[PDB]
Each structure stands twice: as C-alpha cells, then as structure tokens.
Amino acid sequence: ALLNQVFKSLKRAQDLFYHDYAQPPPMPEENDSLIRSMKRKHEYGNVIKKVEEMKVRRENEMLALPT
C-alpha cells in the first residue's frame, strides 16, 4: 500500500523542517492578494466616488472640459 511510502516521506520532510513546525501555515501572496482584490471590487466599490471627489477638485480650480 502507498501509506507506508507516504508515511516515511512525510516523516522525513517534517523532520527536516522541524525548526519551522512552531510557525503557523502561511497564506500565499497570490491567495492573499486575490482576497483583497475581490474585496476592493465588491465591497469597497464606492471608491469610484473617491476619484469623483478627486475629479471635483480637478474640475473646480482648473482647466476647460472637453469640446
């Protein structure tokens, strides 16, 4: 059965990384960023109005609009 080879391979890998066992499992940067990107799209989508407020500071006190 595969279990024996799996056990011996896992045990050696764990033993080689023994000093890291106390560290929590990481979150990959790809996974962390894709959570944040979805949150910025679906929850904080009101940032469209932030750049409109920035736009208003450009439209007031500055140059001509298109013609």
């Binding site: 279990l3 799996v6 056990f7 896992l10 045990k11 764990q14 033993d15 023994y18 066992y21 106390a22 929590p24």
Partner: protein, 101 residues
Amino acid sequence: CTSEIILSKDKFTRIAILPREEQMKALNDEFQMYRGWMNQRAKRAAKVEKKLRVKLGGYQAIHDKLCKKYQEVTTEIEMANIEKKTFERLGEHELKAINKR
C-alpha cells in the same frame, strides 16, 4: 497521516502508539500551539481595531447625531402630515356649518 502524526518526546510520532498520558501531553501542547497562534493574531487584531475605533469614532459620532436628528424630523413630518389632512377635512365640515348657521 495528517491526523496520525503529532510530535512527542522531541520527535514526530504516530499518535496511536503513545501512552495515554503522553497523548494527553501531546494533544495539550498541540492545543496550546494553536491557541498561541490565535493569541498572536487576536492581539494584533485588537491593536488595529483600537486604532480604527478612535480614528472612525468621530465620523460615527456625526452619523449617530444625524440619525437622532433625522428620526426627530421625520416623526414631526409624520404628525404634521396627519394634522394637514384632518384640518383639511375639518375645513370642509366647517364650510358646511357656515351655510347651516
């Protein structure tokens, strides 16, 4: 294997072969490890929360004040719109009373 392998006696071990009291020690320390990671996160989360509470509290206190004002105003509008409709209907009845008197 991920259920079966837990450290004991400063080595990785099969959980099922250990003495019962050694299983208690192993599982206790495994529990305390995860609770340590929680505590490390919770203290950081509380730290950022405490900053947000004082950073945002002024905006929230403004919104809380506006809610109290808005509830007062809309209940006044409600009663005023009631009063308009009764006095209008009463004004019709008084007009008939003029003709009768």
